[PDB]
Amino acid sequence: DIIVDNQGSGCMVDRPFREAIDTFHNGLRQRIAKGEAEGYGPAREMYGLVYDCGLEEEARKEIKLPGYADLHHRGVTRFSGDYEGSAISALKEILETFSADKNSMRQVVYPKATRFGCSGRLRRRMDWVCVYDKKPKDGESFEGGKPCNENKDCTYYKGSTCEWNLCYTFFAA
Ligand SMILES: [Ca+2]
């Protein structure tokens, strides 16, 4: 399981923060796909999120003007925390805490999202948002299909590569 990057240089965020948030996201999705994440239910077709520097730049605009991403019909998640130590270890922890927000995690785990980008600002407090290309609806079922072994197994979107039992596509629009 390795990060998949598209773009660019709206990627302003230091690699370790990016990879931390991406591994948190896709680590969870891959487990849910294999039906083996305590609390998330049966196996299903799951797309990996592509890390997208364009969506990271959108996340940047959403931090400095909330409401922006909704205008472009995007999913958004937010997480913050007061902290004192190393910035990076603060974030590792915040994500743990984040991962207990049933509401937030619906966007994080939505099987039909295919790309996202996050951004953060330090104020000690850190604030992050991630922007997602697809936003679920309230009550929308996430179950469906099977975890993929080969490309044929991916059905939600055209031209998907199955890897690490996650489906990837660069064209979901
Ligand atoms: Ca393969």
- Domain boundaries defined on the chain: 1-173
CA 134/CA 69 separation, integer angstroms:
11
Contact 116, 107 (CB under 8 A): no
Element (H, E) at 2: none
CA 68/CA 113 separation, integer angstroms:
19
Q: How far is the CA of 148 from the centre of ligand 1 (A)?
A: 10
Cis previous bond, 8, omega within 30: yes
Q: Looking at the domain 1-173, which fold is it? A: Pathogenesis-related Protein p14a (3.40.33)
CA 73/CA 168 separation, integer angstroms:
21
Q: How far is the CA of 36 from the centre of ligand 1 (A)?
A: 21
Q: How far is the CA of 145 from the centre of ligand 1 (A)?
A: 19
- Per the rule left: phi > 0, alpha: psi between -120 and 50, beta: everything else, 159 is left
Percentages of the chain per state (helix, strand, coil), in multiples of 5 = 35, 20, 45
Q: How far is the CA of 163 from the centre of ligand 1 (A)?
A: 5
Contact 45, 52 (CB under 8 A): no
Q: Give the gyration radius of the chain's Cα atoms.
A: 15
Which among 110, 136, 130 is positioned nearest to 45, based on CA atoms?
Answer: 110
Q: How far is the CA of 166 from the centre of ligand 1 (A)?
A: 10
Q: How far is the CA of 170 from the centre of ligand 1 (A)?
A: 17
Q: How far, in Å, are 9, 15, 155, 167, 168 from residue 172 at the CA level?
A: 21, 25, 12, 12, 10
Report the structure determination method. Answer: X-ray
